[PDB]
Amino acid sequence: GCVXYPWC
Protein backbone atom coordinates (compact mmCIF):
# COMPACT_ATOMS: atom_id res chain seq x y z
CA GLY A 1 0.00 0.00 0.00
CA CYS A 2 0.88 3.69 -0.10
CA VAL A 3 0.77 5.01 3.46
CA UNK A 4 0.02 8.72 3.27
CA TYR A 5 -0.68 8.48 -0.46
CA PRO A 6 -4.08 6.76 -0.74
CA TRP A 7 -4.18 7.92 -4.36
CA CYS A 8 -1.70 5.24 -5.41
Residues 1 and 8 sit within 8 Å (Cβ to Cβ): yes
Chain centroid to Cα 6, Å, comes to 3
- 4: number of CA atoms within 13 Å, CB side? 0
CA atoms lying within 13 Å on the CB side of residue 1: 4
Experimental technique for the deposited model: NMR
The beta-carbon contacts of 1-8 under 8 Å, at least 24 apart in sequence, are: none
